[PDB]
């Protein structure tokens, strides 16, 4: 009868704010996490608020298209930032090349880590506008696929399971790199928590085929 | 070393081609499934072909943005059509209102089946341009969420698990309804295989939280 | 003080409804012009209504993003359909290859009419999803440019002056060609009112450089 | 016979690089103009290069969709930045409220400068992702319309004549305002060269109705 939608919370950074120095600044982490990521969480919740109010009869009409777009963009922002932080680890700890199933999967689907790294780097550097590059697991095939995302919710589609994501909205790098997205993406390699990615990939491998 | 990407296949319709009459014509099913859906499968595979050729060194350069966009749009087309067919059942068998966990989940998150039906119908009817309305499971919250999708890969974002989808590209209805998307979406309710949706929702409920 | 925004009208078809047979059906013209084009006009006006009501204080708040998107999509729909109809002429009268400044301009910028026709046809056939191909005049350079448009208001940008446009939303062709957009675009060549295009191009040539 | 497409040039800033201090930094102007704007010019030209090479037979096949998208995004970037710079004037000289036909037009279509300023500010602040807010002249009606643009070439459509544009890609403000787009847009008001806008609006008023 009465709808109470579960709202979104800003997850804590998985490390302290200078953990990614000198590749990503504490300052970038503060803006990026506590302001931009927070904004997407809040934007997602604000859609949910409109929906709820409509469904519980406090709002008479709702612009379902606008609320959908709002929800989806901001939820995309939330989930992708959440992934993004998880995918990184202190400059010491993360980085280097993946081992385990993920490393093997990358070799299988891109030939080598270096060929993957190159194509993935280029996918990130060549997001037109702002967005993301994502290494995803395709449940249909079991193949890894590189995706781009523009904004948080254009170009990307469903069912693909993102394992690793790099944000190339300018705010991810502008404080530290200004316009030099390329030099950001290049260095971001050294922050990758490949265990995190591995663990996600293991989970992905064991998700039931939902559609096909 | 040598990449061999797993290509996509056009799944068989889950019923004969006049199974959805008089709501959706055999003719629509023939065009929609065997031509449009096929085209997305083929378009997805053609991206994979470019990627492979690039990665195995037959193509020197690849436009990673273009191949990404191509892959994602067409894969979206494939997966969403695949869902779409599965979500329907002969005019006899499917339709009516959901029971089981899904029916309860709809009541919980939209108040009633009728409030959901109204909002979902409006989400479909008010896709701007062409796209989809999707009833999805949000693994983060356990909430159902209504999404829109424009094309197969705009507005939508990742992580959300689509349970039920209605295509509102014009080709889904134009043969049978011409411009009257609304009358199509209204009738499409009578084709819903709610067991299919239930089964997907059960699977969704038991997918490990991938991100958050 | 009191805002009264000028609303949009559906312009009359520039020929009777069977004027484009057998390439485009009267039936297609009826749906396409009197329903789809009308819908964009109405959608554009409905945005204007929200804006006005907001600005004159009848609506307290407005979702400026949503109204902007609404206005722009539908205005795009209106203006592009308006162009589209004007660009065609009875199967007898229109068609063939352009002479005058436009024909020369096409030769200059694409090498030959056949090279232009091929690339323009391919641009139309390869709109991903629905949209338009447009032959535009670039005031900055004086060059013709081929554009795509997705929906009526994605991919395209401002300042470019559209001269000739072909709609490849499915509704432009589905009644007559079903999924065979290609065969539609191929035949649409025979409807082009090249004088209309010429006249527009003359006007374009004599528009003051607005920006650059 | 042989196509030689006219490429794009980066126009000079219409003032020295610290002319907009303290609202927009010299540093922002250097990155924004000499790197980001330059990048769009170059990206536009690189599309033109592919087109030319294809048309003159040096490239066998072209991905017309990809080149179209590339051209349109970057040309949008070029033309909109070009407008953006022109629309600003040293903190001394520009700013305040418009007089002349433009000031009257704003009063006519938004009620008052303050109502316009509020709605326009909100349109800029509420671009989802990155893009632009634009005050445009609608040749069809003679009405001013506020547009949003996402990236340089989404949401916007043709025929509308942009008079005034504010960039809300993060790079327009991030150096000076970090995430505080709102405080940027608010201050940007003080840089508006309203004479520039007036002059453009005069030109717009005297452009022949191209379509309708
Ligand atoms: Fe970000
Ligand atoms: Fe479809
Ligand atoms: Fe149309
Ligand atoms: Fe910019």
Determine the distance separating the centroid of ligand 3 and the alpha carbon of B169, expressed in angstroms: 13
For residues B68 and B173, state if they share a domain: no
Dist. CA C122–CA C137, nearest whole Å: 19
Helices (H), chain C: 26-31, 38-55, 64-86, 100-110, 113-125, 174-177, 181-188, 194-205
Dist. CA C154–CA A4, nearest whole Å: 36
B26 inside 8 A of chain C by CB: no
Determine the distance separating the centroid of ligand 4 and the alpha carbon of D23, expressed in angstroms: 15
| Cβ contact, residue pair C73, B169, below 8 Å | no
Specify if D17 maps to a domain. Answer: no
Dist. CA D161–CA D209, nearest whole Å: 11
- CB C41, CB C10: distance < 8 Å: yes
Give contacts of B 103-122 with A, CB under 8 A: 107-112, 115, 119, 122
H or E segment at C147? strand C144-150
Q: Which of D46, D67, D89 is the last residue of a domain?
A: D89
Counting ligands in written order, which one lies closest to the CA of residue A81?
A: 1
C1 inside 8 A of chain D by CB: yes
B68 inside 8 A of chain D by CB: no
Specify if A13 maps to a domain. Answer: no
| Residue C45 in tokens | 């006006």
- CB D128, CB A151: distance < 8 Å: yes
Determine the distance separating the centroid of ligand 3 and the alpha carbon of C36, expressed in angstroms: 6
For residues D53 and D115, state if they share a domain: no
For residues B126 and B204, state if they share a domain: yes
Instruction: Measure D81 CA to nearest chain C CA, in Å.
Output: 10
Instruction: Measure C42 CA to nearest chain B CA, in Å.
Output: 14
Determine the distance separating the centroid of ligand 3 and the alpha carbon of B28, expressed in angstroms: 20
D75 inside 8 A of chain A by CB: no
Chain A nearest-CA residue for D151: A129
Instruction: Measure B151 CA to nearest chain A CA, in Å.
Output: 9
Q: Which of C58, C89, C120 is the last residue of a domain?
A: C89
Is the alpha carbon torsion for B88, B90, B91, B97 positive or negative?
negative
For residues B172 and B152, state if they share a domain: yes
A142 inside 8 A of chain B by CB: yes
Best residue in B132, B158, B203 for a mutation probing chain A (most A CBs within 10 Å)? B158
CATH number at A194 reads: 3.55.40.20
Q: Chains meeting B at 3+ CB pairs closer than 8 A?
A: A, C, D
Q: Is B167 annotated as a binding residue?
A: yes
Q: Which of A38, A65, A89 is the last residue of a domain?
A: A89
Q: Is B152 annotated as a binding residue?
A: no
Q: Any idea what the Cα angle at residue A79 is, between residues A73 and A85, rounded to 5°?
A: 130
Instruction: Measure D151 CA to nearest chain A CA, in Å.
Output: 6
For residues C151 and C102, state if they share a domain: yes
For residues B74 and B38, state if they share a domain: yes
Dist. CA D74–CA D72, nearest whole Å: 5
Indicate the residue of B129, B154, B171 with minimum beta-carbon distance to C174: B171
A174 inside 8 A of chain D by CB: yes
- CB C158, CB D131: distance < 8 Å: no
Residue D146, classed as helix, strand or coil, is strand
Helices (H), chain A: 26-31, 38-55, 64-86, 100-110, 113-125, 174-177, 181-188, 194-205
Look up the domain containing A185 and give its range: 90-212
Chain A residues in contact with D25 (beta carbon < 8 A): none
Chain D residues in contact with B66 (beta carbon < 8 A): 63, 65-66, 69
Indicate the residue of B83, B110, B128 with minimum beta-carbon distance to A211: B83
Task: Using DSSP bridges, classify how beta strands B144-150 and A161-167 pair: parallel, antiparallel or unpaired.
Answer: unpaired
B86 closest CA partner among B30, B33, B39, B138: B33
Specify if B66 maps to a domain. Answer: yes
For residues A127 and A202, state if they share a domain: yes
For residues D73 and D39, state if they share a domain: yes
- CB C175, CB C27: distance < 8 Å: yes
Quick count: other Cβ atoms within 10 Å of Cβ B93?
Answer: 13
Specify if D16 maps to a domain. Answer: no
Chain C residues in contact with A63 (beta carbon < 8 A): 63, 66
| Residue D17 in tokens | 């690089």
Instruction: Measure C112 CA to nearest chain B CA, in Å.
Output: 27
Specify if C7 maps to a domain. Answer: no
The long-range contacts involving D24-31, CB below 8 angstroms and separated by at least 24 positions, are: D24/D88, D24/D172, D24/D173, D24/D176, D24/D188, D24/D191, D25/D175, D25/D176, D27/D175, D28/D171, D28/D172, D28/D173, D28/D175, D28/D176, D31/A178, D31/A179, D31/D171, D31/D175
**Residue A135, phi then psi, degrees to nearest 5:** -95, 120
- CB B82, CB B200: distance < 8 Å: no
For residues B157 and B110, state if they share a domain: yes
H or E segment at D84? helix D64-86
Dist. CA A97–CA A107, nearest whole Å: 11
DSSP string, chain B: ----PPPP--PPPSS-TTTTTTTS-HHHHHHIIIIIIHHHHHHHHHHHHHHHHHHTTSSS---HHHHHHHHHHHHHHHHHHHHHHHTB--TTTS-S---HHHHHHHHHHHSSHHHHHHHHHHHHHT-SSSEEEEEEE-TTT--EEEEEEETTTBS--SS-EEEEEEE-SGGGTHHHHTT-HHHHHHHHGGGB-HHHHHHHHHHHHTS--S--
Is the alpha carbon torsion for D99, D102, D106, D109 positive or negative?
positive
For residues C114 and C164, state if they share a domain: yes
Specify if B17 maps to a domain. Answer: no
CATH number at C83 reads: 1.10.287.990
Deposited experimental method? X-ray
Specify if D8 maps to a domain. Answer: no
Dist. CA A105–CA A120, nearest whole Å: 14
For residues D42 and D133, state if they share a domain: no
Quick count: other Cβ atoms within 10 Å of Cβ B60?
Answer: 7
Specify if D142 maps to a domain. Answer: yes
Q: How many domains does chain C have?
A: 2
C63 inside 8 A of chain A by CB: yes
Chain C nearest-CA residue for D144: C5
For residues C210 and C115, state if they share a domain: yes
Give contacts of C 176-205 with D, CB under 8 A: 200, 203-204
């Amino acid at each position: 009868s009465v709808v109470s939608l579960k709202r979104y919370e800003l997850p804590p950074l998985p490390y302290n704010y200078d953990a990614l120095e000198p590749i990503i600044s504490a300052e970038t982490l503060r803006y990026h996490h506590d302001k931009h990521h927070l904004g997407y969480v809040n934007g997602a919740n604000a859609a949910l608020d409109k929906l709820e109010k409509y469904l519980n009869g406090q709002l008479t009409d709702i612009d379902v298209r606008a609320v959908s777009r709002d929800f989806e963009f901001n939820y995309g922002g939330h989930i992708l930032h959440t992934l993004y932080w998880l995918n990184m680890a202190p400059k010491g700890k993360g980085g280097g090349t993946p081992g385990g199933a993920i490393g093997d999967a990358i070799n299988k689907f891109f030939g080598s880590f270096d060929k993957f790294k190159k194509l993935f780097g280029d996918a990130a550097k060549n997001v037109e506008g702002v967005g993301w590059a994502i290494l995803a697991y395709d449940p249909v095939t079991g193949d890894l696929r590189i995706l781009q995302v523009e904004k948080h919710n254009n170009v990307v589609t469903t069912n693909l399971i993102p394992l690793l994501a790099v944000d190339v909205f300018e705010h991810a790098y502008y404080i530290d790199y200004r316009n030099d997205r390329a030099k950001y993406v290049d260095s971001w390699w050294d922050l990758i928590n490949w265990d995190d990615v591995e663990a996600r990939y293991q989970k992905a491998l064991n998700t039931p085929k939902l559609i096909l």
